[PDB]
Ligand binder design. Sequence first.
Ligand code: MG
Ligand code: MG
Ligand code: MG
Ligand code: MG
Ligand code: MG
Ligand code: MG
Ligand code: MG
Ligand code: MG
Ligand code: MG
Ligand code: MG
Ligand code: MG
Ligand code: MG
Ligand code: MG
Ligand code: MG
Ligand code: MG
Ligand code: MG
Ligand code: MG
Ligand code: MG
Ligand code: MG
Lengths: 134, 77, 52
Amino acid sequence: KLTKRMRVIREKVDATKQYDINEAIALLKELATAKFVESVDVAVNLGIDARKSDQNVRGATVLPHGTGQVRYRNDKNGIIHTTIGKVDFDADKLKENLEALLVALKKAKPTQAKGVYIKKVSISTTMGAGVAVD
Amino acid sequence: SRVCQVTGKRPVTGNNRSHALNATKRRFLPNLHSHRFWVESEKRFVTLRVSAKGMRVIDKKGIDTVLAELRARGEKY
Amino acid sequence: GIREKIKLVSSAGTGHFYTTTKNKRTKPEKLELKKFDPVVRQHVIYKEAKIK
RNA sequence: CAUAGGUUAAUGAGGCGAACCGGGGGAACUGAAACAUCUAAGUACCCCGAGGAAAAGAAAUCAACCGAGAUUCCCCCAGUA
RNA sequence: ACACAGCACUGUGCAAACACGAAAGUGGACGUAUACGGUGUGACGCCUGCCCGGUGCCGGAAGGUUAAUUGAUGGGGUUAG
RNA sequence: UGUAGGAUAGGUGGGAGGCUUUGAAGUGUGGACGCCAGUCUGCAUGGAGCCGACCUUGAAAUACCACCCUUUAAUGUUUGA
RNA sequence: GUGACGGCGCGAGCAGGUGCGAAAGCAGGUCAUAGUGAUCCGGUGGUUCUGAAUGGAAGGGCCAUCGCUCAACGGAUAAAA
RNA sequence: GCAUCCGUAGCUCAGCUGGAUAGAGUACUCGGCUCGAACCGAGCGGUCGGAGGUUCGAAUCCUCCCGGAUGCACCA
Ligand SMILES: [Mg+2]
Ligand SMILES: [Mg+2]
Ligand SMILES: [Mg+2]
Ligand SMILES: [Mg+2]
Ligand SMILES: [Mg+2]
Ligand SMILES: [Mg+2]
Ligand SMILES: [Mg+2]
Ligand SMILES: [Mg+2]
Ligand SMILES: [Mg+2]
Ligand SMILES: [Mg+2]
Ligand SMILES: [Mg+2]
Ligand SMILES: [Mg+2]
Ligand SMILES: [Mg+2]
Ligand SMILES: [Mg+2]
Ligand SMILES: [Mg+2]
Ligand SMILES: [Mg+2]
Ligand SMILES: [Mg+2]
Ligand SMILES: [Mg+2]
Ligand SMILES: [Mg+2]
């Protein structure tokens, strides 16, 4: 079923287990396998669900590294799909970019929210697999 | 009487406590049961009046070991 | 007695509050008043809240 | 086969006694100006066992950053927490 | 007044119901529904009408509610960092 | 499946890619589900085609890849009836 | 001032911040006198007050405030013909 | 003091099951025919308990209340 291109992607990433930021960003740099330069795609799931009206969050963040001003809005399934920047960005810079996004997200969290604010944090590229961040 | 032959558990007395904290004297008796234990060494069945807690210790201690203590106690199994 | 007691909490975040009553049949809109706050020693706007 | 049982022989125990002691059970009157929780009180009483005493007893104890060093009894701490 | 023979209802299949008993056991009964216990009525004669809403009892079990038990999940306290 | 439709686009992204002897599209009803529209697809079938796709669509499409949800068909497991 | 008391009532003036007036000034609820419930217990918010070895914490204290037709209304008990 | 659920021709209820825009029986009018019975079919009689949140899509989902119910709780 799966072709060699798709099977090597899942061979490089074993998403069944969690990874640390340092390792996760290393995987992202080795996952860049496309004809065109790719963009990091954020895959962060929030324990809070936007099914409650008052718990919706709208925010903005200016990034020095750039992609540098990005916006974000929670969907119905309470998931965050932003972009920290291009894949060619240095690993250390990318870690700062996502970290700045994450701290701004913590400020946006409402008091009414219950449970683990950030249920899961994952990163993926255009054709890359999702690597969890810790 | 209601005495365990292994553990020596005997009836004890306490209080029935209501929602209004009224205290009436009561008794707590052991969960005693007459059981026929198979002792391999004598190839026989020996009947003992044991509590449910005594049954658990028989598995842990072995049927022969408890009887040795019983003879020291002179309980006349 | 059918009028129910309410508490007016200061907006300054000190946690000081006043208590009063309000008529529930009329005046549904929340109660806003400028009252003295002893913690900050200033007159600030007090907002209606729920006694709990 | 054994075992239960049975017959002998050796020792020991049986009962009594004032209080004190340990343990197994355990009230009510009364006080609360009534009365249930509580108090009286683990008292009266009943039962079992032991001794000249009994019981307890050689820290899985206390202290507070200094230390003390089994148990029992008396005076304080204190009618304090 | 009570008892009374008689009458009716009801429980009871016999390790019977029931009763006395912490329990063993005993009575019921060395009886077995033509028996036993309980209740009301009270020979005999003619008869015993209507009400199941209330309170009990009996039958039903789909749904609602609901204990011990199990402990999903969320919230706090503490601190490695 | 709002609709519009390009309509079996659930949403969320990346998304000119897609596509590809590995069998170009592909025939044989393979059936199921589903709007019963349509869709993927069971083994062969033949031999280079295959596809982003403007008015509209919130959006641009079962072209595309990653990530979720829903619907869940089966699968072991763990508790119960 | 008025009460045995618990208590209740009146009050110029002072400090900080206000409102209405150009100002003098007035405003610490309503013309006044009824519109009410002690203590205990529990709940909520605040607080460098306390924190049973120490650092926290629980709990307590203080401040704000909630829950009795306790109407037999100085209220015997949470619970009674 | 919470927890859940219910509210729809005048009435009794489906809720047009959770947004891709109201149904029946009864009440009433007319008609079918017919002395009343008794039968039938049309029509009429509802803005969906009310007010806030979303989205292109809610009487239907979220918040807030109102009334009703069943639960629990309960020792000022
Ligand atoms: Mg007593
Ligand atoms: Mg003697
Ligand atoms: Mg007494
Ligand atoms: Mg008395
Ligand atoms: Mg008395
Ligand atoms: Mg005792
Ligand atoms: Mg008579
Ligand atoms: Mg009669
Ligand atoms: Mg009846
Ligand atoms: Mg009936
Ligand atoms: Mg002025
Ligand atoms: Mg005036
Ligand atoms: Mg401490
Ligand atoms: Mg504290
Ligand atoms: Mg301590
Ligand atoms: Mg406190
Ligand atoms: Mg009085
Ligand atoms: Mg009195
Ligand atoms: Mg009390």
